[PDB]
Enzyme design. Structure first.
Site, mmCIF file in Angstrom:
data_model
loop_
_atom_site.group_PDB
_atom_site.id
_atom_site.type_symbol
_atom_site.label_atom_id
_atom_site.label_comp_id
_atom_site.label_asym_id
_atom_site.label_seq_id
_atom_site.Cartn_x
_atom_site.Cartn_y
_atom_site.Cartn_z
ATOM 1 N N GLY A 44 0.803 -1.207 0.000
ATOM 2 C CA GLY A 44 0.000 0.000 0.000
ATOM 3 C C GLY A 44 0.842 1.266 0.000
ATOM 4 O O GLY A 44 2.074 1.230 0.036
ATOM 5 N N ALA B 199 1.512 3.761 2.319
ATOM 6 C CA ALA B 199 2.451 3.978 3.434
ATOM 7 C C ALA B 199 3.619 2.986 3.387
ATOM 8 O O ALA B 199 4.790 3.366 3.557
ATOM 9 C CB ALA B 199 1.729 3.892 4.798
ATOM 10 N N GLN C 176 6.052 3.741 0.369
ATOM 11 C CA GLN C 176 6.850 4.952 0.532
ATOM 12 C C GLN C 176 7.842 4.826 1.679
ATOM 13 O O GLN C 176 8.935 5.387 1.615
ATOM 14 C CB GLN C 176 5.949 6.170 0.707
ATOM 15 C CG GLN C 176 5.268 6.559 -0.595
ATOM 16 C CD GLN C 176 4.373 7.804 -0.497
ATOM 17 O OE1 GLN C 176 4.042 8.289 0.598
ATOM 18 N NE2 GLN C 176 3.967 8.318 -1.665
ATOM 19 N N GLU D 256 -3.002 -0.084 -6.814
ATOM 20 C CA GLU D 256 -3.017 0.921 -7.867
ATOM 21 C C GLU D 256 -1.574 1.265 -8.201
ATOM 22 O O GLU D 256 -0.655 0.957 -7.423
ATOM 23 C CB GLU D 256 -3.806 2.184 -7.477
ATOM 24 C CG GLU D 256 -3.342 2.917 -6.180
ATOM 25 C CD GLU D 256 -2.688 4.257 -6.479
ATOM 26 O OE1 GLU D 256 -2.416 4.533 -7.667
ATOM 27 O OE2 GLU D 256 -2.458 5.052 -5.536
ATOM 28 N N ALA E 97 -7.909 0.055 -3.202
ATOM 29 C CA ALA E 97 -8.926 -0.492 -2.326
ATOM 30 C C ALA E 97 -9.954 0.550 -1.919
ATOM 31 O O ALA E 97 -10.905 0.209 -1.200
ATOM 32 C CB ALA E 97 -8.282 -1.104 -1.084
ATOM 33 N N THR F 191 -5.569 -0.991 1.246
ATOM 34 C CA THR F 191 -4.581 -1.984 0.841
ATOM 35 C C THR F 191 -3.730 -2.436 2.022
ATOM 36 O O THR F 191 -3.623 -3.635 2.297
ATOM 37 C CB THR F 191 -3.700 -1.386 -0.253
ATOM 38 O OG1 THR F 191 -4.534 -0.851 -1.289
ATOM 39 C CG2 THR F 191 -2.760 -2.451 -0.838
ATOM 40 N N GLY F 192 -3.127 -1.479 2.746
ATOM 41 C CA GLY F 192 -2.327 -1.826 3.914
ATOM 42 C C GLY F 192 -3.058 -2.709 4.905
ATOM 43 O O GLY F 192 -2.427 -3.513 5.598
ATOM 44 N N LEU G 86 18.338 -9.654 16.289
ATOM 45 C CA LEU G 86 16.958 -9.267 16.562
ATOM 46 C C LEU G 86 16.116 -10.431 17.101
ATOM 47 O O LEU G 86 15.276 -10.234 17.997
ATOM 48 C CB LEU G 86 16.313 -8.683 15.305
ATOM 49 C CG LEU G 86 14.826 -8.371 15.440
ATOM 50 C CD1 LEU G 86 14.570 -7.347 16.546
ATOM 51 C CD2 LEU G 86 14.286 -7.886 14.099
ATOM 52 N N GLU H 274 17.056 -12.792 18.984
ATOM 53 C CA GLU H 274 17.381 -12.989 20.388
ATOM 54 C C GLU H 274 16.662 -11.977 21.276
ATOM 55 O O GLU H 274 16.246 -12.315 22.398
ATOM 56 C CB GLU H 274 18.900 -12.916 20.563
ATOM 57 C CG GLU H 274 19.407 -13.405 21.890
ATOM 58 C CD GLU H 274 20.904 -13.576 21.885
ATOM 59 O OE1 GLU H 274 21.441 -14.078 20.871
ATOM 60 O OE2 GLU H 274 21.552 -13.105 22.849
HETATM 61 N N1 GTP Z 1 4.418 7.440 8.001
HETATM 62 C C1 GTP Z 1 3.752 7.395 6.852
HETATM 63 N N2 GTP Z 1 2.403 7.101 6.849
HETATM 64 C C2 GTP Z 1 1.716 7.052 5.681
HETATM 65 C C3 GTP Z 1 2.361 7.297 4.477
HETATM 66 N N3 GTP Z 1 1.449 7.186 3.487
HETATM 67 C C4 GTP Z 1 0.252 6.875 4.034
HETATM 68 N N4 GTP Z 1 0.400 6.792 5.393
HETATM 69 C C5 GTP Z 1 -0.657 6.471 6.368
HETATM 70 O O1 GTP Z 1 -1.482 5.443 5.858
HETATM 71 C C6 GTP Z 1 -2.839 5.677 6.175
HETATM 72 C C7 GTP Z 1 -3.717 5.285 4.992
HETATM 73 O O2 GTP Z 1 -3.214 4.103 4.410
HETATM 74 P P1 GTP Z 1 -2.515 4.141 2.960
HETATM 75 O O3 GTP Z 1 -1.264 3.297 2.979
HETATM 76 O O4 GTP Z 1 -2.195 5.562 2.562
HETATM 77 O O5 GTP Z 1 -3.605 3.505 1.958
HETATM 78 P P2 GTP Z 1 -3.193 2.330 0.935
HETATM 79 O O6 GTP Z 1 -2.217 1.389 1.602
HETATM 80 O O7 GTP Z 1 -2.609 2.897 -0.337
HETATM 81 O O8 GTP Z 1 -4.560 1.535 0.635
HETATM 82 P P3 GTP Z 1 -5.723 2.209 -0.251
HETATM 83 O O9 GTP Z 1 -6.735 2.827 0.684
HETATM 84 O O10 GTP Z 1 -6.400 1.151 -1.089
HETATM 85 O O11 GTP Z 1 -5.134 3.277 -1.142
HETATM 86 C C8 GTP Z 1 -2.971 7.150 6.519
HETATM 87 O O12 GTP Z 1 -3.606 7.290 7.770
HETATM 88 C C9 GTP Z 1 -1.554 7.678 6.593
HETATM 89 O O13 GTP Z 1 -1.309 8.235 7.861
HETATM 90 C C10 GTP Z 1 3.718 7.594 4.471
HETATM 91 O O14 GTP Z 1 4.299 7.815 3.410
HETATM 92 N N5 GTP Z 1 4.410 7.643 5.663
HETATM 93 MG MG MG Z 2 -3.701 3.822 -2.394
#
Ligand code: GTP
Ligand code: MG
Ligand code: GDP
Ligand code: A1D69
Ligand code: CA
EC number: 3.6.5.-
Lengths: 418, 67, 440
Positions: free
Chosen positions: C10, C12, C15, C71, C99, C145-146, C252, C254
């Site tokens: 996803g 987050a 990235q 995506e 998602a 997704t996450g 880790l 351990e």
């Molecule tokens: N620390 C950090 N958090 C992130 C980042 N991108 C998104 N998030 C967190 O992820 C949450 C939303 O989940 P996402 O990962 O953006 O959504 P996704 O995984 O692309 O799943 P979809 O909803 O289908 O797009 C938000 O509350 C953000 O705070 C990032 O680059 N760094």
């Molecule tokens: Mg997304």
């Protein structure tokens, strides 16, 4: 690419449709010929959401033009940017009666429109869904527009159906059968759309008359407000930003219950960052003639466009919520989300666009319910409709469903967490 | 003691196998009922849209009878 | 051997994976094209960094990683970015429809269309491992997704790789940078589904990271890039023992033995120090005692909660840089006398210590000052359950009115999945209460 397919129908639908394409083509750097003479490329990064790419780097709006009268088609093509639209995407017939648009006249032409919808849809890498511009008070945009929603929804049941629906006001038009046509359309919209922007001619007039001090505001004056709003609410669909917005994510986060999907848009200025926020939540900046302090916010989406300290935006949005905490439902945490985009609309250094799902929208529907029953309890004018094969029960049912929407909006305004 | 040693390792193999087995069956059952439920929801949505076409035909019929 | 495969899921997760792998390359002298001049083992080797990088015959060092998103937007920037040559194209997997912030779409509707392909790519990575130790799974709680795809993947990984180790880096939602109102739903659904399939999960609270960037780096309004550079520093501290050799290096796994007293109590609190701007680090060197002390200051925690009002079940210190055991032991002794460190009565109170000599790296153009020594503390505290309590409460406010539930039901989910998930969370919050009660 996540393509939106745009459809405009009837007298009002095609007018506001052209202005929306004028304003966003200007903001994305597309001229009437479809060529890109653009300064920044943020304009082109998500340009495929709304524009088909053509050979020779032409951009054709993914737009379909429909009317049961051939006249307004001609003005569109003659109007500014009229050459940018694809000529096959014009569908026209040869009367202010919802039944004619939905059941008899509109049905005769609806199969032809779907053929055009299909063509644009099959070229899409991943279709988001549709956005329809129309009025609810005429015959074509109202009746045929809602028939088109049902037919498109039948063929794309897993796509999002979004509309910009223009509600009638006696302050703008005197046609008496508007409350019938509006009520019949709402009956369709409650069942068959995922999101609707209530663009209220009463509020647009009131803004022009009181705020903009126009003694006799024209449909041209009203639509200038509409284009600014439509540009604002589509911002996060069209530009790269901290959120990858699309029509489904808008629906999921704004619509807590399927039927409560009618939004109050707001715009400001009609400035300082505190002032933009203060005005944007002001009843006088709403495009739906409702006072938010007469209800509660289920959800809110706020878009700030232009150059400004996002730290200050964050504090002011937190500030307005803390000071107005009573008007946001407590059983939906963090129900206000803000987005910031660097490009402002034409003529403004800074703007704020507001999208509210407020239970105060019931005031809009209540107003139409009054004008409706004023006629129906007299059985007045039913013959224009029963003459087309419609049954009294149908008017009672559409009335009853819209009555239910107001109750449901009232039910969650009164709900509490504890 | 040798008997107990291989019973311990057989038990470890049996628990790990059973966990794998139940996870595989759990999501197979979950995806099956998810697919049914989503299809039932889409089927109901079409069934009501189709009723709208039945009603629209009747409306035009009643108009003809009025002639 | 002992390879680790990273899975980034996803927005987050992808990235944060970008930040982490960039930092790993800088730490190991790997160029954006994947060449590592100091590696004389061409095409192979059993070096410590080989747990995270494989090698081609052409001398390219390739992350043992898969990026998955439903995506293409976020992974496309990896495909065209500074480190594009680092990854084989098959390691970067994208669908076309995300998602839409909906766990049910990540887990079922959209996710099920790509899960087999994702497991095929993971399998190709595992087949290149002579001693695969396990997986590191990065994702947000809040995204569609996450949450939904990750839990589907964790379920499939338990099936396809027995009880092979699975660790998580999980982004806990914060209002300052969140994107959806339904994040509490997605968090509880994925925490419930994943609980049995994860051995150890590091929660990173975006509000804690957001506050640290504002307070300690003087960043007015932190972006994802600001948060991720700090997060990658914490991730690097945790994985440093796997990626570097060292006489005082402690694995880790351990630390995990100590951090996980019962299978469900597997959420360590991470605290990291020093986080300091270049302007402030100048003519100001932080000693072992100072950075150790900072690990017991709640403002430096990856998760907002108060360990002073909870009980400890374990305490681990992961040092990197110019640190010797003598300084560490001196710092701990004074801290014990001066701080509120209460252990549960059934576990020993000593602190487990690891030291890696390779000092921390910073990404050029970042906000962190480059320091001589750093430390990440990993503690098992009952206090971390507060974060569950805040999320469960937000979930309850909405679920009592069934707000937004129709978006999940419309994708095939049942109400019983929500209540089953919320009951597991209630039992988790109760587990954390029970481990903190004195023995009889
Ligand atoms: N620390 C950090 N958090 C992130 C980042 N991108 C998104 N998030 C967190 O992820 C949450 C939303 O989940 P996402 O990962 O953006 O959504 P996704 O995984 O692309 O799943 P979809 O909803 O289908 O797009 C938000 O509350 C953000 O705070 C990032 O680059 N760094
Ligand atoms: Mg997304
Ligand atoms: N706000 C606004 N309302 C309009 C406009 N054009 C029509 N309407 C409203 O729509 C109703 C009539 O619908 P109409 O436009 O005639 O539909 P059509 O002729 O089938 O396209 C009237 O009650 C008007 O108030 C417009 O440009 N702006
Ligand atoms: C209530 O919480 C939310 C409200 C809306 C959203 N989404 C998806 C948005 N989609 C678009 Cl198109 N524009 C905006 C502008 C500001 S948020 C937003 C997300 C969360
Ligand atoms: Ca090597």
């Amino acid at each position: 690419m996540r393509e939106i397919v745009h459809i405009q129908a009837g007298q009002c639908g095609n007018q506001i449709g052209a202005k929306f394409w004028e304003v966003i083509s200007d903001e994305h750097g597309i001229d009437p010929t479809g060529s890109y003479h653009g300064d920044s490329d943020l304009q082109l990064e998500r340009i495929n959401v709304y524009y088909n790419e053509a050979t020779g780097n032409k951009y054709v709006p993914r737009a379909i033009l429909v009317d049961l009268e051939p006249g307004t088609m001609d003005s569109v093509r003659s109007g500014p940017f009229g050459q940018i639209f694809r000529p096959d995407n014009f569908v026209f017939g040869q009367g202010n009666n919802w039944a004619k648009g939905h059941y008899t006249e509109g049905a005769e032409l609806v199969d032809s429109v779907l053929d055009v919808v299909r063509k644009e849809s099959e070229s899409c890498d991943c279709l988001q869904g549709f956005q329809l511009t129309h009025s609810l008070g005429g015959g074509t945009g109202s009746g045929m527009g809602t028939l088109l929603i049902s037919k498109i929804r039948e063929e794309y049941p897993d796509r999002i159906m979004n509309t910009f629906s223009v509600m009638p006001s006696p302050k703008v038009s005197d046609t008496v059968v508007e409350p019938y046509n509006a009520t019949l359309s709402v009956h369709q919209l409650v069942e068959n759309t995922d999101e609707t922007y209530c663009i209220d001619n009463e509020a647009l007039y009131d803004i022009c008359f009181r705020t903009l001090k126009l003694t006799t505001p024209t449909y041209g004056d009203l639509n200038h407000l509409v284009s600014a709003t439509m540009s604002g609410v589509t911002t996060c669909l069209r530009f790269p930003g901290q959120l990858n917005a699309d029509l489904r994510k808008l629906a999921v986060n704004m619509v807590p219950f399927p039927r409560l999907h009618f939004f109050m848009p707001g715009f400001a200025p009609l400035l300082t960052v505190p002032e933009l926020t203060q005005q944007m939540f002001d009843s006088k900046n709403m495009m739906a003639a409702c006072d938010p302090r007469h209800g509660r916010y289920l959800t809110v989406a706020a878009i700030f466009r232009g150059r400004m300290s996002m730290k200050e935006v964050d504090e002011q949005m937190l500030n307005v919520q803390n000071k107005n905490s009573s008007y946001f439902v407590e059983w939906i945490p963090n129900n206000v989300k803000t987005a910031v985009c660097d490009i402002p609309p034409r003529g403004l250094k800074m703007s704020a666009t507001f999208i509210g799902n407020s239970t105060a929208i019931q005031e809009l529907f209540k107003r139409i319910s009054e004008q409706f029953t004023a006629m129906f309890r007299r059985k007045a004018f039913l013959h224009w409709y029963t003459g087309e094969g419609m049954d009294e029960m149908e008017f009672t049912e559409a009335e009853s469903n819209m009555n239910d929407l107001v109750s449901e909006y009232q039910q969650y305004q009164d709900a509490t967490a504890d | 003691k040798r008997e107990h040693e291989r019973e311990v390792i057989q038990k470890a193999i049996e628990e790990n196998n059973n966990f794998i087995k139940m996870a595989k069956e759990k999501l197979a059952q979950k995806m099956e009922s998810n697919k049914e439920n989503r299809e039932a929801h889409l089927a109901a949505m079409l069934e009501r849209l189709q009723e709208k076409d039945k009603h629209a035909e009747e409306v035009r019929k009643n108009k003809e009878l009025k002639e | 051997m002992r390879e680790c495969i990273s899975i980034h899921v996803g927005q987050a997760g992808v990235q944060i994976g970008n930040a982490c792998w960039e930092l790993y390359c800088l730490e190991h002298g790997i160029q954006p094209d994947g060449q590592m001049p100091s590696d004389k083992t061409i095409g192979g080797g059993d070096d410590s960094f080989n747990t995270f990088f494989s090698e081609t015959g052409a001398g390219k060092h390739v992350p043992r990683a898969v990026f998955v998103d439903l995506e293409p937007t976020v992974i496309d920037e990896v495909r065209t970015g500074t480190y594009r040559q680092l990854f084989h194209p098959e390691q970067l997997i994208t669908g076309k429809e995300d998602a839409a912030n909906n766990y049910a779409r990540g887990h079922y509707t959209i996710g099920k269309e790509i899960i087999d392909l994702v497991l095929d790519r993971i399998r190709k990575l595992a087949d290149q491992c002579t001693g695969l130790q396990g997986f590191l799974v990065f994702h947000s709680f809040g995204g569609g997704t996450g949450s939904g795809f990750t839990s589907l993947l964790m379920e499939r990984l338990s099936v396809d790789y027995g009880k092979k180790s699975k660790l998580e880096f999980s982004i806990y939602p914060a209002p300052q940078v969140s994107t959806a109102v339904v994040e509490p739903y997605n968090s509880i659904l994925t925490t419930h589904t994943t609980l049995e399939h994860s051995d150890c999960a590091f929660m990173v609270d975006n509000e804690a990271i957001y506050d640290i960037c504002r307070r300690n780096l003087d960043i007015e309004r932190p972006t994802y890039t600001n948060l991720n550079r700090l997060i990658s520093q914490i991730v690097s501290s945790i994985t440093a023992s796997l990626r570097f050799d060292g006489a005082l290096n402690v694995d880790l796994t351990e630390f995990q033995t100590n951090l996980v007293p019962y299978p469900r109590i597997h959420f360590p609190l991470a605290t990291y120090a020093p986080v300091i701007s270049a302007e402030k680090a100048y003519h100001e060197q932080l000693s072992v005692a100072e950075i150790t002390n900072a690990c017991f200051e709640p403002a430096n925690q990856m998760v907002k909660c108060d360990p002073r009002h909870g009980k400890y079940m374990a305490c681990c210190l992961l040092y990197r840089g110019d640190v010797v055991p003598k300084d560490v032991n001196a710092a701990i002794a004074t801290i014990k006398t001066k701080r509120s460190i209460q252990f549960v009565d059934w576990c020993p109170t000593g602190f487990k210590v690891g030291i890696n000599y390779q000092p921390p790296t910073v990404v050029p153009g970042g906000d962190l000052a480059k320091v001589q020594r750093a430390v990440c503390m990993l503690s098992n505290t009952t206090a971390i359950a507060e974060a569950w309590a805040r999320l469960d409460h937000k979930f309850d406010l909405m679920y009592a009115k069934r707000a937004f539930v129709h978006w999940y039901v419309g994708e095939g989910m049942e109400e019983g999945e929500f209540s089953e998930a919320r009951e597991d969370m209630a039992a988790l919050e109760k587990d954390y209460e029970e481990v903190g009660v004195d023995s009889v």
